[PDB]
From a paper:
The first co-crystal structure determined reveals ligand bound in G2 only, in a narrow pocket formed by conserved residues from all three SLH domains: Arg61 (corresponding to the conserved SLH-Arg43 of the TRAE motif) from SLH1; Met107, Gln108, Gly109 (corresponding to the conserved SLH-Gly29), Lys110, Glu127, and Lys130 from SLH2; and Trp151 (corresponding to the conserved SLH-Trp13) from SLH3. The pyruvate moiety of the ligand is bound deep in the pocket through salt bridge interactions to Arg61 and Lys130 and hydrogen bonds to Gln108 and Gly109 backbone amides, while the hydrophobic face of the ManNAc ring stacks against Trp151. To further investigate the activity of these two potential binding sites, we performed isothermal titration calorimetry (ITC) analysis of SpaASLH binding to 4,6-Pyr-β-d-ManNAcOMe in solution, which revealed 1:1 binding with an apparent dissociation constant (KD) of 29 nM. Upon binding in G2 of wt SpaASLH, the phi angle of Gly109 (SLH-Gly29) and the psi angle of Gln108 (SLH-28) each flip by ~180°. Concurrently, the removal of the hydrogen bond between Gln108 and Arg61 allows Arg61 to make a bidentate interaction with a pyruvyl carboxyl and O6 of ligand. The backbone flip requires the flexibility of SLH-Gly29 in this location as the resulting phi–psi angles are disallowed for all other amino acids. Therefore, the near universal conservation of SLH-Gly29 suggests that this backbone flip is part of a conserved mechanism for SLH–SCWP binding.
SpaA possesses three consecutive SLH domains near its N-terminus, followed by a large C-terminal region presumed to harbor the self-assembling domain(s). The crystal structures and binding analyses presented here of P. alvei SpaASLH, SpaASLH/G109A, and SpaASLH/G46A/G109A with synthetic SCWP fragments provide novel insights into the functional contributions of many conserved SLH domain residues, including SLH-Trp13, SLH-Gly29, and SLH-Arg43, which precisely interlock from three different SLH domains to generate two active binding sites.
Author numbering: 28 to 192
The structure:
């Protein structure tokens, strides 16, 4: 029965998550940018970084932005598409929510969204969130609309990696 900290240690050693300078603090109560999560997903599923392509219009989404290869890589993979197709905003500094994370992971694992699912998640996300709860990636008592904590993301990422194999 591994702890969240032991799961983090494992994922860090595998380069999927990172820690923080000068400390052993994995900061498991803190949250994570959608940019950082994109990089998590790339490391977790072994995707190819995509350089010199920019599919979004956010301020400072350009070549000087370290996250673009990652965000592009998950966009090409179909795991993420940003918050508005018309204006092409990804929101890379915005924090990843439990239901957003649920979408990326169910899709990556090729699990089926639950049609007509009922739960506290935003309408677009109810099927993904329910599917993630069922697979054990988050607890049914998690707030789907909340920023996901690192801990929650470690546990989701660890479970996902195990299913993946
Ligand atoms: C506000 O609209 C939502 O934004 C979500 C943001 O995060 C992810 C995981 C993503 O694809 O980046 O999911 C997005 C939702 O699918 C949804 N976006 C749209 C265009 O409907």
């Amino acid at each position: 029965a591994k702890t969240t900290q032991e799961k983090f240690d494992a994922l860090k050693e595998a380069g999927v998550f990172s820690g923080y300078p000068g400390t052993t603090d994995a900061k498991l109560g803190q949250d994570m940018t959608r940019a950082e999560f994109a990089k998590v997903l790339v490391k977790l599923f072994g995707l190819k970084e995509i350089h010199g392509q920019y599919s979004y219009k956010d301020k400072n989404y350009d070549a000087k932005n370290w996250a673009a290869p990652f965000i592009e890589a998950v966009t090409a993979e179909g795991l993420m598409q940003g918050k508005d197709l018309t204006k092409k905003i990804f929101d890379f500094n915005g924090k990843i929510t439990v239901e957003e994370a649920s979408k990326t992971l169910v899709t990556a694992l090729k699990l089926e969204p639950v049609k007509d699912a009922q739960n506290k998640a935003t309408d677009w996300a109810k099927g993904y969130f329910e599917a993630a709860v069922n697979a054990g990636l988050f607890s049914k008592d998690a707030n789907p609309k909340a920023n996901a904590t690192r801990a929650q993301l470690v546990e989701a990422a660890f479970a996902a990696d195990e299913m993946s194999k």
